[PDB]
Design a protein around this ligand. Structure first.
Ligand SMILES: Nc1ncnc2c1ncn2[C@@H]1O[C@H](COP(=O)(O)OP(=O)(O)O)[C@@H](O)[C@H]1O
Ligand SMILES: Nc1ncnc2c1ncn2[C@@H]1O[C@H](COP(=O)(O)OP(=O)(O)O)[C@@H](O)[C@H]1O
Ligand SMILES: Nc1ncnc2c1ncn2[C@@H]1O[C@H](COP(=O)(O)OP(=O)(O)O)[C@@H](O)[C@H]1O
Ligand SMILES: Nc1ncnc2c1ncn2[C@@H]1O[C@H](COP(=O)(O)OP(=O)(O)O)[C@@H](O)[C@H]1O
Lengths: 66, 373, 373, 373, 373, 373
């Protein structure tokens, strides 16, 4: 239930920094709050739940959370 | 009246040189010969036919670069003569006719290479004496132990030799033609997937630098592949001399994996770990336990991170689980062969092992087969 | 019952489309997108936003011409949906959602090209099934033999690949970047010597027409230069669309000669004959004899007169003299990449290797990397 | 729509106004403002300050005549308001505030011309909508085609403009200051040769009336000089208002040769055929084949007999022999600039391109450049 | 010492001649030949067939002025002989039969121009030696640096060449036909829009003087247009030779902007900054870094105030942000193409590169391609 | 007795098969199993899991070849089953259920091999009867005499047995693991000195072909080296399958004599002649005369030229001089192990010694130890 702002969790390979402690690299979008999540992806966590794995990963890549 | 004998290591990629009895080589420079490929329009400047060494690397943008040695065998002899002359007169500043010289070569080679080296070095450079040694024996000398198995992988050739109590076994010597040049070519072939195009020799040098800086050996290949496909932690950014920034990503560990599985390059041969195991198992049954405990790595190709753990794990998987496997990789392994030369020419008895000019005048260039292992 | 699967050949210079069982392609047209540079002045005439295909070729004066494909890689995609929509709905008059689609691509390409092609063909056009194939593999299907090495030289790239007994060797595939567009640019550069200037994109089609009409490959380059400098027998006259007459003269065999000596454009890479020979020597020993006897030419760039004899002479000079080399050049090689593709859509065993729609739905656009090739 | 727009062409010599959708202009009258002479019998004139139109033309004996248009440029604006007031109230007898107004303008004119024209119209006539068009596009509209080169030759200026499929080429528009007024002045200068003298503006109108009825263009200048010097077959007689008869003879075809040889007037520029050829050659190399076949003549100056054959011969001499040249000379070309305007106000699309009262009200007089070409 | 050679720069706008070794040319005069237009009524006044050079500027009223050079190519050779005779015998008073001659030529042009120039100076002038060199190579001699990219812009030709360490790249040489005369014609076409009319060849010199005195390059275009529209602080007054006063204003910076946006003239080609960037990116990857920091401006056309800042801003926008851009603009760059030539004839190693009279006698006019670049 | 028993001799190198009572075998083919190693991209080409026999050697380019038998021991059994199926059904077209079979193996072999051979022959192929014999005994049968010593040298093992009047002495049976495969490996090792490199399995087959074609045994070794080093009188040229020509030269007599001196290969065992001498001394005293006079050779390894004279010289040097030495080498020794086996199947007595299916079901697979030898 870690809560963090949006573009600091955006990981850029240019910077190689700005990583928070004690977060799993695998799944970063869970820690985003619901209203920030709805800002970023324009869709609820439920219907994000039905989405396929490749489509979800493409959504991460678009939002630069991959 | 002690004169320091010159020790010159002429590898496939880079050439090193120094004096006997020292700790580190004085001269280290790439063995690259460059030639111009464009039109010269400024009359007034000096004309230079060939660029040798680092001077070829500094102005590589207008040159075709050629290696005089590939796969451990030299082909263009004039370029090799230019490399030797630049080593003797510009990097060490010594008279070649005063000091003896010591050279290195691969274990299995065409027979004419030693004879041509001997003929060139007594005729063109007029040296008083010389000797030709095998790089793996010098690596074992620099390791400081009498017994062990030496796996030396340079820029052009890989070879494994076993030695027990100073007695080398010639029938268990294994030579494999896998080295860093094939890894660079494979990195060229796999960097096209991301959309980056590298085609000329300057691009070859850039790709070689990329491989040197941002490559590592995976401990588990399938685990690393799944992790790299699932997320984007394994990504690094390198910017070219032009200024464009490229991202490698997955290709960091796929290129070093060609050493362990040569099926990626199309070769049917076994990996380096199975090559070492087959070289060990070809020896006698009694001396295998000592060869497990004294495995020595050498060469710059074994400079990748995580190579020792993967080698130890693979050999432990191959070997029976009663004998205890130790891998010995010194941090300064890249120069270790040359360091062996600094011991070999410093021994008291080795002064009776030189190939004198008089014996050359008796027996032609074929004395090197009788006097060198 | 069974429904025919239309095959679409996407090329840098020309795009072709047809049905599975047809002898010849249904429609062939250049892959050009035109946009009006000027400003419309007439009220009520109506204006068209973009010109796609042959119409854009007709109104060369008032348009700027853009190629969506450069060097075999799709640079602009909106032009590619424009071209595919014009292919499906205008040149064929067929609904694309009831037929399978077969596409061709270069051997060494970025994977994003394949994923984007699959994603556009599935999400937008609603194709039930589609497949991606290499062009020079289809060249052997058009030829009718199961063993040989293929030259495929189009307008974007020039790739050679050997296949022996139906098995392809991925490590011997070579992709030279020299193609017909570079020859067009070189013809533009060498036509400035006589005084004729061609600058705009609308004149590139005129230069291409001059190249197609009055160019040939010399058997002996220096002899032909001496003959051209001696007399004026080999001089031809071309008529421009607006009425002037130009005399090409010497340059006719100096445009495609750059295919065999790429140092004219400043490229370091070897010629096409040396590329074929190096692709041969990268294979194994036992299959080179069959590969010399089955060299197959393909692509429009190999439509110059006398290229087969020059290639045969150069390969015979390079190869050992004890065995014979024949260059197999069918008179309809320009459509061979299409024709074999049609043969790929007619076999009964090809039905279950189509990429199903629900397979794409469950596995993403990366299914092309594991289903095709 | 029952509401009919007005089409007004304000030429340098004559103004032609009418209703939209008609084949012929309803009112045609010269644009001449006559002011009282400084001396003698102004008694017949009453309260009125000046005369405009045909009544100024009838009473030439007591008036000095002034043209408000100088080379297509408005120098006096009060005279233009008088001309427009006379047009709107003494010819059509319709209120300007109920009907939209369409106006014409030469291509290369100052920006202040359109802004001042729109400002005067909107301020002093309260028209709900108005538009400014270019003359030669209207001529091409009246011709019925959307591709060709238009040469307009009015009473103040000559201009050539090409159009390809409705896209005008602003970089190929050519403007030459050679028209009927300079020809009238040259005819006056060469009529001194016989003995007749004209200086007064009324005598300017007399010379213009002579030119409009007796001049023609020679096919061959030297041949016509020889046949005029050989015999008196070409002489014709004109009757002056004062009752005596003059004979022109030789110089009836010497007046229009200033159109093809402007060195007679002393100016530097070239003839109309050279101007048309240079306007054609300034276009792209691809569209010229259309522009040679669709040459369109216009203007009142081009009504001399034999102009079409002479111009066709000159352009055929200039152009390459392969091309086919055809000159389109309609018999109604004198009103063509009006006629196409009657077409342009009739189209349904043009109803969306009027300049409304509100748009002028917020945007000032600068809306013309943004809304019109 | 040896005889100092004559450096002659045949620029399209001006011809500049001087002895080698000096820091400034001794004779600078426009390359204009004028011929009489009207007739000479006076008897005994003396007759002159043509006025060459500066005297043609003295009497512009009664002449037709022609340039023997247009777009860097010689169109009339009798005028060139007159120009060269006036240069040698009048402006310098030197015997050309005892002096070598250095000439300056555009990079890409018709090839027969060099042969004709060689024939002219070995037949008519009987010079003992002659050499021909490219403009930008002499410019980069005058800059003082061996490595850099040179952009030159005169009255007929703009061209960019890269040179790295004295080695030129022929495939990266770029040529554009947008130059000073096109800017003068555009200035005439845009000054027509304010009501001022310039038509004759004499007024082209006045328009060129107006451009040289009252034109500058805006750092930001649309901001400058908004500033010029909002206030009247950018207006400037110019005095005509006959006493009239005109106002330029907004047209001060629109004429040079056509150098950066060639769509104003109707050209399709890119600007000078895009041309320089494209010429840089055509080079190899390693030599680009030294080329981005050594950009050299040359030629008269780049004398506009504020062109260096605009060029630096555009190139920095196109270039990657990691690297820095240096624009080298000497304050005396207009004669730079001459000054480096004065360097080239002063080198001791250049004397072996002269084309001898005997060499020309042996090989005819075709020798100049073998000796010169 | 009416039926004919099958005779199958399946050594490590070759597999031969035929019917009883025939002088020659019916099928002779190499005992290799090949698997494809490359990606196959062809639709409808057909798929073959494995290649067995001559068709495996015909396609060595795209195959990896494995020998099912190493040193006379069956390492892999599925490949051996495939070979037996191909021999029974494809090379003979016979039903295995209708005939008995006879199989050969080396004398000193693990009995698990014999038990597994018995189990495979009975359980899968359902043969009614089967016998297992010793190769050298069948060779002595083929020689035609009862008393003699047989030194058989196959491709996997070399064994010597004495027989006196049909009585076998098991304590004098000698076995060495030195055979033709070791000689092939040594030839590959010594071919590196001249520059020829052979690594993969197809290259191994090429090297074996070279060994079969150009090898001979010298009578005197050091004299042969002196002759080969003094002049080039002993050299031969071999043509590679890809057209290259190699020169074997001095190595011709170095490969085959490693049987006589195993110290070249690192093994400490004695030569074959000393093996035969020690086997003779391991027998009794009075039976040494007949063993001296009845020495025979067998196997393809004894097919080298001049081996018989050298063996006779070494034996008569080792043996006392007073006795007679015969070395009997039939010209068809290569099939002798087969031939005598057919004779063994032609006897009326021996077919009381078949291992019946009833006996196998009665006593398991271990009956072959009591029944055979
Ligand atoms: N730190 C490193 N990491 C990875 N690879 C390296 C490193 N240093 C050198 N190499 C590789 O090793 C090669 C140099 O090997 P080297 O020891 O010079 O061989 P030799 O001396 O036998 O020619 C280079 O081609 C390079 O690719
Ligand atoms: N029938 C005719 N024959 C010869 N010239 C004529 C004839 N009618 C008119 N013109 C010339 O045309 C001129 C009128 O041109 P006009 O059409 O009014 O120009 P604009 O196109 O600007 O209205 C007159 O000056 C006259 O010289
Ligand atoms: N002070 C100046 N300000 C602006 N433009 C100038 C100036 N001096 C020269 N020019 C431009 O440069 C041109 C002269 O270039 P020039 O060096 O004579 O060309 P070339 O290199 O062909 O001799 C003129 O046409 C003019 O437009
Ligand atoms: N004519 C020959 N000359 C030299 N060597 C031969 C000849 N024929 C066969 N050989 C060698 O003998 C081997 C074949 O032995 P073979 O008798 O077939 O073994 P097996 O006893 O298993 O049947 C081959 O590997 C080959 O190298």
């Amino acid at each position: 239930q870690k809560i963090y702002p949006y573009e600091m969790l955006v990981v850029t390979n240019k910077g190689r920094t700005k990583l928070p402690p004690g977060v799993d690299r695998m799944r970063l979008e869970r820690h985003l709050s619901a209203e920030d999540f709805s800002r970023v992806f324009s869709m609820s966590p439920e219907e994000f739940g039905k989405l396929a794995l490749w489509k979800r990963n493409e959504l991460k890549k678009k939002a630069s959370l991959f | 009246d002690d004169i320091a004998a010159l020790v010159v290591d002429n590898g496939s990629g880079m050439c090193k040189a120094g004096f006997a009895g020292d700790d580190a080589p004085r001269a280290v420079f790439p063995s690259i010969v460059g030639r111009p490929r464009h039109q010269g329009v400024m009359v007034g400047m000096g004309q230079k036919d060939s660029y040798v060494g680092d001077e070829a690397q500094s102005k590589r943008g207008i040159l075709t670069l050629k290696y005089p040695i590939e796969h451990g065998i030299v082909t263009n002899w004039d370029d090799m003569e230019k490399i030797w002359h630049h080593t003797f007169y510009n990097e060490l500043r010594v008279a070649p006719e005063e000091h003896p010289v010591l050279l290195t070569e691969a274990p299995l080679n065409p027979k004419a290479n030693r004879e041509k080296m001997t003929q060139i070095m007594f005729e063109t450079f007029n040296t008083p004496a010389m000797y030709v040694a095998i790089q793996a024996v010098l690596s074992l000398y620099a390791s400081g132990r009498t017994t062990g198995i030496v796996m030396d992988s340079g820029d052009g050739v890989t070879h494994t030799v076993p030695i027990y109590e100073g007695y080398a076994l010639p029938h268990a010597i294994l030579r494999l033609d896998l080295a860093g040049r094939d890894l660079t070519d494979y990195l060229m072939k796999i960097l096209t997937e991301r959309g980056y195009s590298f085609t000329t020799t300057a691009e070859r040098e850039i790709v070689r630098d990329i491989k040197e800086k941002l490559c590592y050996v995976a401990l588990d290949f399938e685990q690393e592949m799944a992790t790299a496909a699932s997320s984007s932690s394994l990504e690094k950014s390198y910017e070219l001399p032009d200024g464009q920034v490229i991202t490698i990503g997955n290709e960091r560990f796929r290129c070093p994996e060609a050493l362990f599985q040569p099926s990626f390059l199309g070769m049917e041969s076994c990996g380096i770990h199975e090559t070492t195991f087959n070289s060990i198992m070809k020896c006698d049954v009694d001396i295998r336990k000592d060869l497990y405990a004294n495995t020595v790595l050498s060469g710059g190709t074994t400079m990748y991170p995580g190579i020792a753990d993967r080698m130890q794990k693979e050999i432990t998987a191959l070997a029976p689980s009663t004998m205890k496997i130790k891998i010995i990789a010194p941090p300064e392994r890249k120069y270790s062969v040359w360091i062996g030369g600094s011991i070999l020419a410093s021994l008291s008895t080795f002064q009776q092992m030189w190939i004198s000019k008089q014996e050359y005048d008796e027996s032609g260039p074929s004395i090197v087969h009788r006097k060198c292992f």
